[PDB]
Amino acid sequence: PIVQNLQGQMVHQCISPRTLNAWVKVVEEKAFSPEVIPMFSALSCGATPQDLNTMLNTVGGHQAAMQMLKETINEEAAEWDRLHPGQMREPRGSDIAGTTSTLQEQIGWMTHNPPIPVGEIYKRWIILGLNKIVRMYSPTSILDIRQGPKEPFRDYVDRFYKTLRAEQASQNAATETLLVQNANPDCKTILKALGPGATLEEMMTACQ
Amino acid sequence: PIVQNLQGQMVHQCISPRTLNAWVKVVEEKAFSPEVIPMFSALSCGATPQDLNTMLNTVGGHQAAMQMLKETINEEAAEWDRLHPVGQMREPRGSDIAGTTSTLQEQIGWMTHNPPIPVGEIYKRWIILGLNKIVRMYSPTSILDIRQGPKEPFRDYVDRFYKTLRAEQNAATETLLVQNANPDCKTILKALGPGATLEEMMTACQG
Amino acid sequence: PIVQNLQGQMVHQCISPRTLNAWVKVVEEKAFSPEVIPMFSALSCGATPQDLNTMLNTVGGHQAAMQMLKETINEEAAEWDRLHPVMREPRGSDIAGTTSTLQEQIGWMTHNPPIPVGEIYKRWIILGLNKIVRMYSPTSILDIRQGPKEPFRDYVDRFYKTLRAEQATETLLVQNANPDCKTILKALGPGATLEEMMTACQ
Amino acid sequence: PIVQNLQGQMVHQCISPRTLNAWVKVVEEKAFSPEVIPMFSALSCGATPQDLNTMLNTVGGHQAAMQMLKETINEEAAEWDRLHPGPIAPGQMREPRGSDIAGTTSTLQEQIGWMTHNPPIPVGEIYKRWIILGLNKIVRMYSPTSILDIRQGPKEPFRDYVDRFYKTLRAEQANAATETLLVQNANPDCKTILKALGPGATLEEMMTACQ
Amino acid sequence: PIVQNLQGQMVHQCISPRTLNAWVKVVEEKAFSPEVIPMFSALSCGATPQDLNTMLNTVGGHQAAMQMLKETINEEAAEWDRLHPVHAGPIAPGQMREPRGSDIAGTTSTLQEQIGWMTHNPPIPVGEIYKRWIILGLNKIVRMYSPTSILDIRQGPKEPFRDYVDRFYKTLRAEATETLLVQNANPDCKTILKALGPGATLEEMMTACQG
Amino acid sequence: PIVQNLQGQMVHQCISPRTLNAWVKVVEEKAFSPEVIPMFSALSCGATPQDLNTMLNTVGGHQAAMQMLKETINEEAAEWDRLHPVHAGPIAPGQMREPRGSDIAGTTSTLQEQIGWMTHNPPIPVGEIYKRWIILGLNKIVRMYSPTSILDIRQGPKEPFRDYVDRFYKTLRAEQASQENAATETLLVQNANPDCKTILKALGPGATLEEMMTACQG
């Protein structure tokens, strides 16, 4: 990663072993749950393209999803070439992904004046691929999330928005109407009686 | 977060994996017990709005509470815009404090300006308000229904009493504490008279 | 907390997640054994009143004891005001961190001469923890007697473990030994060291 | 490892107990799965030849693979002695031979010097390259199955089959050919649907077309 | 403790949670085995008298031993007052008041006074002096906790010679003695050993009775 | 230990609780396996003689082995005294007295003296000299705790060849003090099981270990 000293200069540092282990443990314990993407973005703060490849390469299984991620990176690299086809040489799509660029060249673009943040650009592509993976690996559709007859309303809302976050790539009024439609008859009657425009706080209080 | 370097300047620093891991474990273990809010306020010391969004986004379960927290954040941002209508520095909107329409460099520019506009501390106040609602929501019992069992030691009844009172939130609470004790200890408490401290009440009912 | 820099400067730092977790685990594992108090004193080294409230607020259970601690703080704060009647000097609530900002707390601790509001508050907290440790001690020192088949060292272990939670004592130790060892202790004479008393009744 | 102090100078540092325990646990828990190589290169970031020998020596199991690694290291050392075959000028350093890069006949002070020289000589990065070439061979040999024998079971979800496919492919390569193999060894049910999608299908499309 | 900063000055530092938990854990797991004394000495590196009292006060249980240690500290503090009597009168400018035994033990001295002695030029190491008093008391605790003396250990006729030497030097650490190990062996190994006779290294002894 | 300050100054640091606990655990879990020795050397990087004595003194059990290590240290110290006798007289200003064997072992030298030696210009590395003496004694311990001879490592009738080679070079490493021959690989072929030994002989002489293990993968 590229960080700055206690004095105040941008320097390259080796990826910490604690960061490497934290990322491996997240994939092993959470698979591709939606919260894996914000964890990846945080653990790769200031990462070079080389660091991002290191993090992706330490992932054990899930190689079908990883190949899909590599294909997404290939698409974004080709689109970058179409949008960008004494003067400094500017990076190609393969330079941002780190397949045709050295660490020295990556540091050059990132600490140039003005800078080309090849690390941030690459991270954008990776997060795009990770979003496509989370959506596909979502077990259930949001339309199949229905409150059981003996399931508390709070536990039902937990499954609802957990599913919604995986399908929307963590990114409305149709959601609220679906949450009410798929509540059990007793709770739905109460929710209907609350009048439109009720907050989630008022809905969960009314169905306690 | 924004920390201090060895030149007196406030510099930006990546959020550490130990801080991220600590906050995730706190939610997994304590759920929304009252002590989760001082833990969040301390782990987010010096956090930017981006760092605050990172911490909330790494919470996997309890998405009903996190959605409730997002609605609280939206309500506080709209109220901020109402109280702040449109070489002068541009001031942040509610969506800038929440980090939805502001870049990291803009957030750093506000927090390190002279004088500073602490968008990180303002956002943290909106989050803590939402967490207060969640903790009160997850409180399994109202304070009025906390009653000492006929065989329950007085110390264990007081533990439940003040844990509940803290989750919901004084002469009214002392009245309720003595009123809801079992008949045995209740007569020993009323026999003490007014001005009895909790230490005195727990000693008189230790048997 | 306010700590020495690497460049010889007293600066304010965020409280460590390591330190917070250590204080939480101590209360969970040890409840209110006597050794909780020296652990709290070391973990709050250099702490502001804000940091001290943060530590106390992370305690999840034992809210009966924490309420007792809260009432002890209020009695110490009210006594501070009576002993300091009206450079603005801090009131009792300023030391307790209820009416003072972090910037005012730093303004007192790093003044020349300093008003150590963090050290004063920690003293009030430790006085409150002393009362909790005493109240949560199961047995009085007078009820500690040596069993007929209990080795002397095991009886001394329980005697001073109880005495630490409570707080002469030498008289009680010999008086409450079993009739056998009690004879050998008085046979050695007065002013015998504990080592000499434990080797005689081994 | 050779890091940099605040005075912009490259200083030598002791290997952390964290990095040591990490590399040991990596080999103990993951054996020689393909992800161990990038974990070694990252844990050996900025390492001297001595640091690399220390990490390899803390591995106590799999001594058969470690001996193979030694044999690969000796081959690459003899190669270097050929493509890079005496009074040393003041301020300069001796030319490194293959045994010097591997740390057998070199000293830490010489290693620090080469890696800090104003004309830099990265003996550690050259040694790491030789080690990774050897680890590539170990990963290939420890692959229990060949790519040509990866076949989708009758009730095996396509997702699990592609997982085993590309895990094997990554261990052997330590491309239409792989795709044609992927569609061929899919169970007859999925194979038909995949042939129907036509050519030039993305893995994302083939997987949602075989859920 | 007292550590050196980036300006070559000895400054005070808060005792770390890792240091506290480590000392508590070694007492919980090892009681007062002889190895707890070098562990105490290493974990108390740079400690002030205040730090040493914190470490002793966090010890749970074993309060009879802690009481003996407390009495040993009082004896050494009284001996210090006898050998270093404090002189009355005003204290020279830029100088520290002379520490008595209670100052070294940390009962009557402030933290600022302890730092003043430990960082003075020349320094009065009240932390090192106090730690010697503590280690002396811990040695007396290790002895009273030792179950068996170095004489009441003998090699079982079926016990291997290595296992016997393990119990030998273990009980010796708790309590020219290498001339008794041969004597208190089993009749078999003894014979073989005496055949080697003099100048016998322990390595030679264990080799002679390997089977 | 003695490390480089961020300001480029060789200064003394206390040994860390992380390092102290790591060494104790290694001996508790791995005993005296060959990989313990490089772990000791890595955890004692930059250590003074006082630190090295601390690490050895915190070891629980194995006191027969630790006594043998102690005697090995005495032999190396006596050899140091015979090769570097201390010249009598006063020590020149700004100089350190000449260390004897007991000073390198940290028995008759203070921490301040050890620091003066290790940071002198040029330095006398009393920590590195002592660590060599410790690794020598640790080599004898590794061989003692590993009694199985390499001549007695034979592949089981149904044992996979890879597991047999694992045991072979693990045993060889313990006997050789991790010091790196045809006779090694020929013994490996000689003591394989009939099925594998045939294939190995069918490969021809002078095969590499990679070729041998690939041939017996079945």
Ligand SMILES: CN(C(=O)[C@H](Cc1cccnc1)NC(=O)Cn1nc(C(F)(F)F)c2c1CCCC2)c1ccccc1
């Ligand atoms: C920029 N920003 C974010 O990043 C937020 C941060 C955040 C705030 C509160 C709770 N938790 C996370 N993150 C999310 O809103 C992710 N998220 N997305 C969904 C989905 F819509 F997909 F269902 C859900 C969730 C979360 C739990 C409900 C379902 C943000 C910040 C302030 C207001 C608005 C947005």
Ligand SMILES: CN(C(=O)[C@H](Cc1cccnc1)NC(=O)Cn1nc(C(F)(F)F)c2c1CCCC2)c1ccccc1
């Ligand atoms: C600013 N300050 C705080 O932050 C304190 C710090 C503190 C002090 C003692 C024990 N533990 C925490 N924290 C609290 O008083 C939280 N608290 N709140 C309740 C409630 F009444 F709501 F139920 C309870 C509790 C906790 C003990 C049971 C009931 C504070 C400081 C000194 C005096 C007054 C306030």
Ligand SMILES: CN(C(=O)[C@H](Cc1cccnc1)NC(=O)Cn1nc(C(F)(F)F)c2c1CCCC2)c1ccccc1
């Ligand atoms: C300032 N100082 C302290 O802090 C000491 C440090 C210490 C010393 C030895 C063992 N362990 C802790 N700590 C204590 O004396 C706590 N203590 N208190 C009791 C009590 F009598 F109250 F029951 C007991 C104990 C502990 C052993 C059983 C009975 C101190 C230092 C040197 C001499 C005098 C005081």
Ligand SMILES: CN(C(=O)[C@H](Cc1cccnc1)NC(=O)Cn1nc(C(F)(F)F)c2c1CCCC2)c1ccccc1
């Ligand atoms: C330089 N670079 C790398 O280092 C990448 C980084 C990466 C990217 C996406 C997912 N995971 C890791 N790593 C790999 O491509 C390893 N890899 N190799 C294979 C194999 F070809 F052997 F089958 C497979 C895999 C992994 C997924 C199954 C099959 C790289 C970066 C961007 C595009 C292209 C290459």
Ligand SMILES: CN(C(=O)[C@H](Cc1cccnc1)NC(=O)Cn1nc(C(F)(F)F)c2c1CCCC2)c1ccccc1
């Ligand atoms: C200053 N120095 C020490 O500190 C040594 C360090 C050390 C060296 C080798 C093994 N382990 C520890 N430590 C000891 O010699 C403690 N020791 N004491 C005994 C006893 F005789 F009491 F039983 C034994 C032991 C150790 C295991 C056998 C029986 C020291 C250093 C070099 C040579 C001489 C002394």
Ligand SMILES: CN(C(=O)[C@H](Cc1cccnc1)NC(=O)Cn1nc(C(F)(F)F)c2c1CCCC2)c1ccccc1
């Ligand atoms: C200086 N250097 C070393 O330090 C090496 C480093 C290393 C390299 C690869 C794998 N693992 C460790 N270490 C060893 O060769 C220890 N070693 N010794 C043996 C023995 F022959 F004794 F059986 C074995 C082993 C290891 C596993 C097989 C049997 C070294 C470096 C490059 C080439 C030559 C030597």
